C-alpha cells in the first residue's frame, strides 16, 4: 500500500466533547490502510491518527495502535464489512475498540486500549490511505448502529450524535 499519501477527517470542532463516555462506529470499506480514533480539535492540521500527543488510533490495517507516533501491535486485523466500535471515557479517560461487538483485548489494558487519555476537545476522527473509504456511524438514526447494544450501551456510553448541534458565533 501506499506509504505516504493520507488524509485525516475529523468532526468540526463545536462538537468536542470534554466529559461523558462517547462511542460511534466505523465500517471498513476498503482493504488499504487505515486509522480510527479520537483526536483534540486542535490537533495540528494534517497530522495523522496517533502521530502525535493529540490523538490516539487503531490501525486495524497494520493491526497496531498507535500514539505520540509509536506504534504497537494490538488487536486483530479488519477486513472488508467489519465494524469498528470506537469508545470515548472521559470519566477515567481511557479508549477502547471493538470489532464487530466484540472488544480487542490489549495485553496490558485488556478491554481498554489506552489510559491516560486528557483533554478538553476531543472529535471522532479517522485517517485514510489513498484509495481508500469507510462509514461512521454516531448514533442519529439508533437503529443503524450495529453493535452499541450489546457491546457499549451496557457498560454507559452514549453515541456521539447527540453532541452535534447548537451554536453561539460571535465574530471577535
Same mark, same amino acid.
Given at each position: 500500500?501506499n506509504?505516504?499519501?493520507?488524509?485525516t477527517?475529523?468532526a468540526e @470542532?463545536?462538537? #468536542? %466533547?470534554?466529559s461523558?463516555?462517547?462511542? /460511534?462506529?466505523?465500517? =471498513?470499506?476498503?482493504?488499504?490502510?487505515?486509522?480510527v480514533?479520537?483526536a483534540?480539535?486542535?490537533?495540528?492540521?494534517?497530522?495523522?491518527l496517533?502521530?502525535?500527543?493529540?490523538?490516539?488510533?487503531?490501525?486495524g490495517?497494520?493491526?497496531e495502535?498507535?500514539?505520540?507516533?509509536?506504534?504497537?501491535?494490538?488487536? @486483530?486485523?479488519? #477486513? %472488508?464489512g467489519?465494524?469498528?466500535?470506537? /469508545?470515548l471515557?472521559? =470519566?477515567d479517560?481511557?479508549?477502547?475498540?471493538?470489532?464487530n461487538g466484540e472488544?480487542?483485548?490489549d495485553?496490558?489494558?485488556?478491554?481498554?486500549?489506552?489510559?491516560?487519555?486528557?483533554?478538553?476537545?476531543?472529535?471522532?476522527?479517522c485517517?485514510?490511505?489513498v484509495?481508500?473509504?469507510?462509514?461512521?456511524?454516531?448514533?442519529?438514526?439508533?437503529?443503524?448502529?450495529k453493535?452499541?447494544?450489546?457491546?457499549?450501551?451496557?457498560?454507559?456510553?452514549?453515541?456521539?450524535?447527540?453532541?452535534?448541534?447548537?451554536d453561539?458565533?460571535?465574530?471577535?
Open positions: 500500500s506509504a505516504a499519501d493520507f488524509r477527517y475529523r @470542532k463545536n462538537y #468536542a %466533547v470534554n461523558g463516555k462517547w462511542y /460511534f462506529e466505523f465500517e =471498513i470499506l476498503t482493504a488499504g490502510p487505515m486509522r480514533g479520537w483534540h480539535a486542535d490537533m495540528p492540521p494534517g497530522m495523522m496517533g502521530q502525535d500527543e493529540n490523538s490516539w488510533a487503531f490501525d490495517y497494520n493491526e495502535k498507535v500514539y505520540v507516533n509509536s506504534s504497537e501491535s494490538f488487536g @486483530k486485523q479488519w #477486513a %472488508v467489519d465494524v469498528v466500535g470506537v /469508545f471515557d472521559l =470519566i479517560n481511557t479508549i477502547s475498540f471493538s470489532l472488544l480487542l483485548m495485553a496490558l489494558g485488556g478491554e481498554t486500549t489506552f489510559a491516560d487519555v486528557q483533554g478538553d476537545n476531543f472529535v471522532p476522527a485517517t485514510l490511505g484509495g481508500q473509504k469507510a462509514r461512521l456511524t454516531y448514533g442519529q438514526d439508533v437503529n443503524t448502529l453493535y452499541f447494544t450489546t457491546c457499549g450501551l451496557q457498560e454507559g456510553y452514549e453515541p456521539f450524535c447527540v453532541n452535534m448541534a447548537r453561539v458565533t460571535h465574530w471577535y
